[PDB]
Design a protein around this ligand. Structure first.
Ligand SMILES: *[C@@H]1O[C@H](CO)[C@@H](O)[C@H](O)[C@H]1NC(C)=O
Ligand SMILES: *[C@@H]1O[C@H](CO)[C@@H](O)[C@H](O)[C@H]1NC(C)=O
Ligand SMILES: [Zn+2]
Ligand SMILES: [Zn+2]
Ligand SMILES: [Zn+2]
Ligand SMILES: [Zn+2]
Lengths: 521, 518
């Protein structure tokens, strides 16, 4: 008995086809992904194979004006049109609160939405009862397949799920559900979830009875053979984990932004044991036509969006890709920090903040690049994809020791494409990744403020510094608990996207460089 | 027989009293220099000492809107009022060409103007004949003293003297003039000139018959004891040179910008041999009152000068002092280079240009931030007085590396070649041999979607924005003039910086590490 698992993750509101790097489509012959093209490929496979599941591992929410405007209604609509079979909740599904998850998505989805490790408490429990499930048993041909869901333990620090939801440890929360399925004589079991590649492998190894893990969150690209595009494989597809109970468990993920369709064929015996698995993500390039009906529907909904005028011009590529901004100095990060600093200084009235020259900004907050080849034009739509969260750029007062700890946290688990990696302004930092976590920062110089000419001086642990940063970080987002607990003063500031669009309008032509604000030894 | 030598050099249009750093006076209680205050001090000395000479060692011209508007007439007028006894020509005296010097300095000065190593060729010769002299014999009491003048032979690459003036070696041109004075039995000789401290010491050493050297050009502060202000002494005052004759020859200079009055007392014997000398520059601070009469004349002329509206605000000290910009990265240089780049980018072969060089010698004043941050046209005019343009050139890598070597080839003499930059990270090792001091030179890539710094390559070609002065080989940058591959003239220098300050509204250039030393 063969099962074909088709899988997406971290689509992040890329409803329309995109440029190769997931930014707006311009030359529609090199464009990729989009829901209309996805439909075609799914349809082709459904024509060919008898036992097909189409799964999503979370993070449909957030990423373009589609989501800014339709708030998830577009998600339920097009996922329904694609006839997804199940979805696990990702952290970004909680970005508009539970209220923004229940109403546009949980009420409208025609397929089960899953997470076994999220527990409701207080009044919310009976409100959201049954709207998402820990698992679902799905008929596939004459067989059934159990699908069990999970969501990153870190979600309260990543998104806005509120205080009435408890996020338990994935493995602990999963094992009883998998056991219940086994007592129900479900012998084929897929764990579908949004915790990242490292947790996916742990689940494969530790949760007895799981046959396949379909993951997301870390935007992991896996591939067997020579890759068809710019993404560099982190490992083979599928990635085989040897479980503690001695089984070979395939672990898959499919990058992000709808660029690829995950495709894994599993051979089971009649008792539900995996005999073999093989596949590869399918590049959704222009060789696959966009489905006319879906496309027409897309064009219909695209009308309301067209509103989003030219803000200014860039003469350089604005690299706001996660592969850059979560790993090293990226010019989009520099631009945003420079904008934060610039906008604030143009408030010369407020005396306590009018020399602030230091900025930090989590790479996880930077959600898209902007391409320069379209006459360099930058529009509100382009920018809303970079900064979709509607946050503010705030001022805080911090001890040197706090900042040093923040920079340690920035790389404490480097290599997993997590969001806490810091972009900067008025700061020169050097990391040595070979040293133990907590001790990786080997140089940290900052612009002096009590000096008539700004220059770089070593940060002192017992001095106090003034820093501009996203409110998300001021509130301890991405696990910067030291900032929230230790800050000395916190004033709220201007709206993030307005700050950057203003700066671009003032500057007229921008050209941020990679300058060596951040180095590695 | 005791002679009192009072001396100024490199006043550079500081006619009005100034802030301590030579920029515009704001809080008059803490201000310094200016001709009114100088007059008071000179007068206190003349009234107390029998044998006084007041000498200037050049570079009166250029530095504030006084010179922009009056073009030298203010120099002749106020030097006449102070009754200078002699002046040597400096390089900046040629900024407005020979016509800018003949009229109105040489025609209107009531004192001799000197330079023995400047020779006029062709038709200019008869036109300039006698308007400046190689030497002058001055009666002082019952005695005479000879003064011989000299002017940096680098003047053609620093200023605009034209093709009809020849600038000979100072030492070779001085010796026969000094010999002529000996023939006339003048036994007390002062060399007064504008070539810098190093040349002044060479003159003291090798020109037989010179008793005292009074210099300028390098803005050298010399002092004996604890200095009265921020300037750090480069040596004792006077600086003693041992000549090739075995004689001790005092060498003096008095910083710049009219901040100090040089004061040297010298004891001569009957045969015009220096027995001893002592003194010190006198700090012209607020303990010395401005002469009411000179002040009133200054206040009268000042009317035609009233700048004006605020261009924008700075929240940082804009360090355009020579002690910074000719020695290390200074934030005024960063500001000007970033403005050069910014203006060009928003206003096509050059539309990606990200590299800038600017000689520190073109940066003529700082701007103080403590005046409610305000920046006026007057402030800016003091920083960029030359009316040049910011041009675009195309240069081989090898040329650029040569330029950066030249930049530090004689580091330490406060000369103008030292380069401020944009889009470039340079590292110097000053312990290495001249011509091999550049140990790291990274520049912003051009053929790239995202700008980053990469090592400069000799064989590659770069586009750079820089002053027309450098494109033309000013400051000895011959390699740029001779080797460049394309040169397009650009916008007016002060206009570029003004509009940038205006567009940015609030500025805050930092010292970032664009230039480092090993
Ligand atoms: C689509 O992907 C396949 C596999 O890499 C490739 O052979 C084909 O050329 C691609 N189509 C286009 C239009 O590039
Ligand atoms: C002026 O300078 C001298 C030291 O050179 C000092 O004694 C005097 O106090 C100064 N005057 C003022 C007003 O500071
Ligand atoms: Zn995601
Ligand atoms: Zn996620
Ligand atoms: Zn000078
Ligand atoms: Zn000079």
């Amino acid at each position: 008995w063969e099962l074909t698992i088709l899988h997406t993750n971290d689509v992040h509101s890329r409803l329309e086809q995109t440029s190769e790097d997931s930014s707006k489509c311009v030359n529609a012959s090199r464009c990729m992904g989009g829901v209309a093209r996805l439909f075609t490929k799914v349809q082709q496979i459904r024509r060919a194979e008898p036992n097909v599941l189409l799964l999503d591992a979370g993070d449909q929410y957030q990423g373009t004006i589609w989501f800014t405007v339709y708030k998830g209604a577009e998600v339920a609509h097009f996922m329904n049109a694609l006839r997804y079979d199940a979805m696990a909740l990702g952290n970004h599904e909680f970005d508009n609160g539970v209220e923004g998850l229940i109403e546009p998505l949980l009420k409208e989805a025609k397929f089960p939405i899953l997470s076994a490790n999220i527990k409701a408490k207080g009044p919310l429990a009976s409100q959201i009862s049954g709207l998402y499930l820990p698992y679902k048993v799905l008929p596939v041909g004459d067989e059934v397949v159990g699908i069990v869901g999970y969501t990153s333990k870190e979600t309260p620090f990543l998104s806005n799920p509120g205080t009435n939801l408890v996020f338990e440890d994935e493995i602990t929360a999963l094992q009883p559900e998998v056991d219940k399925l086994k007592t129900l004589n479900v012998n084929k079991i897929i764990a579908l979830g949004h915790s990242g590649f490292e947790m996916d492998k742990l689940i494969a190894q530790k949760v007895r009875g799981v046959d396949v893990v379909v993951g997301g969150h870390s935007n992991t690209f896996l591939y067997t053979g020579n890759p068809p595009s710019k993404e560099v494989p982190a490992g083979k597809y599928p990635f085989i984990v040897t479980s503690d109970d001695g089984r070979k468990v395939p672990v898959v993920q499919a990058y992000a932004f709808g660029k690829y369709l995950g495709y894994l064929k599993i051979e089971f015996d009649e008792r539900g044991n995996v005999i073999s698995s093989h596949g590869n993500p399918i590049l959704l390039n222009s060789s696959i036509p966009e489905d006319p009906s879906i496309k027409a529907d897309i064009n219909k909904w695209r009308i309301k969006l067209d509103n989003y005028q030219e803000l200014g011009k860039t003469i350089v590529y604005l690299d706001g890709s996660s592969q850059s901004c979560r790993f090293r100095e990226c010019n989009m990060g520099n631009l945003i920090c420079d904008a934060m600093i610039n906008n604030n200084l143009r408030h010369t009235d407020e005396m306590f903040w009018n020399h602030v020259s230091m900025c930090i900004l989590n790479g996880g907050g930077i959600r898209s690049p902007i391409d320069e080849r379209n006459n360099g034009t930058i529009t509100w739509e382009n920018l809303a994809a970079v900064l979709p969260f509607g946050g503010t750029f705030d001022l805080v007062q911090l001890k040197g020791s706090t900042l040093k700890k923040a920079f340690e946290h920035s790389v404490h688990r480097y290599g997993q494409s997590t969001g806490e990696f810091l972009q900067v302004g008025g700061i020169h930092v050097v990391y040595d990744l070979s040293r133990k976590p907590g001790d990786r920062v080997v140089k940290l110089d900052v612009l002096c403020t009590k000096c008539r000419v700004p220059s770089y001086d070593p940060l002192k642990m017992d001095e106090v510094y003034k820093v501009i940063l996203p409110n998300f970080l001021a509130n301890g987002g991405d696990g910067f608990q030291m900032i929230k607990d230790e800050l000395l003063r916190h004033d709220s500031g201007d709206q993030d996207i307005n700050v950057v669009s203003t700066y671009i309008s003032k500057m007229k032509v921008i050209y941020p460089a990679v300058e060596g604000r951040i180095k590695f030894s």
